[PDB]
DNA sequence: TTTTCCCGCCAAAAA
DNA sequence: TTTTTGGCGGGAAAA
């Protein structure tokens, strides 16, 4: 009971990846998030919401209808990271680390897009990370006189933590100290 | 002590 | 309206 890991996002995420094969074929494929809430004794739907939203940021899954997702799988993965490299503003990111090191729709908004730009920034000759990339999220997110500092940035650290441990479950990431980098599949 | 991050209020898109 | 989808921060367990 006392342990906080029993309700950690990476447990139910590991079970979520256990629910479906990484390499399926077009069969009777469907997802019902409330049926996931009922098939086990947990949890509140918001957890499956953020897990599903981060899952579709890499095109691993797709929306079909209300309470109706399709699992798809590992096919696009490499094509998704490569298309993200076509979208990549990598020079702005590496230059942003040079700054921090010393001295469509307006409200899309932040979840899937931040996971996408995270997966984009993961590729570089010298993988560097990660709260500096949170500062990149503040600069891309604001780029205005306010600032509006102190607040906001910590919550981006929180959702970035959720993106971190959710990407720690049978996927392309490591567990190295803090500020981690891995992309197993090129 | 700081870092890690869960729970869930509460409000925007759908129904 | 009620419902489904998720931002958003607090507040505490864990390192």
Residue numbers in the entry: 110 to 212, 259 to 341
Task: Reproduce text from the manuscript describing this model.
Whereas the E2F proteins 1–6 bind to DNA preferentially as heterodimers with the related DP proteins DP1 and DP2, the two most recently discovered members of the E2F family, E2F7 and E2F8, are ‘atypical‘, because they contain two distinct DNA-binding subdomains. They also lack the pocket protein-binding domain found in all other E2Fs, and thus are not regulated by the canonical cyclin-dependent kinase/retinoblastoma protein pathway. In this work, we have determined the three-dimensional structure of a non-canonical E2F, E2F8, bound to its preferred DNA sequence. In summary, through extensive structural and functional analyses of the E2F proteins, we have defined the DNA-binding specificities of E2F and E2F/DP complexes. These analyses have revealed that the two domains of the atypical repressor E2Fs correspond to the E2F and DP domains, which bind to DNA sites that are indistinguishable from those bound by typical E2F/DP heterodimers.
Analysis of the structure derived from a cubic and hexagonal crystal forms revealed that both DBDs are composed of three α-helixes and a small antiparallel β-sheet. However, the comparison of E2F8's first and second DBDs to E2F4 and DP2, respectively, revealed striking structural similarity between them (r.m.s.d.=2.7 and 1.9 Å, respectively), despite the sequence identity being only 39.7 and 27.5%. The E2F8 DBDs 1 and 2 are thus referred to as DBDE2F and DBDDP hereafter. Of the 82 residues that comprise the linker, 23 are resolved in the structure, forming two α-helixes that wrap around the surface of the DBDE2F and DBDDP on the opposite side of the bound DNA. Whereas the interaction between typical E2Fs and DP proteins is mediated by separate interaction domains, in E2F8, the linker between the DBDs strongly contributes to the inter-DBD interaction. The two DBDs of E2F8 recognize a 5′-GGCGGG-3′ core sequence by inserting their helices α3 into the same major groove of DNA. The major difference between the structures is that in contrast to E2F4/DP2, E2F8 binding to DNA is not symmetrical, due to differences between DNA recognition by DP2 and the E2F8 DP domain. The first Arg residue 313 of this motif in E2F8 DBDDP forms specific contacts with the oxygen atom of guanine G10′. We also observed an interaction between symmetry-related molecules that involved helix α1 that potentially facilitates the dimerization of two E2F8 proteins.
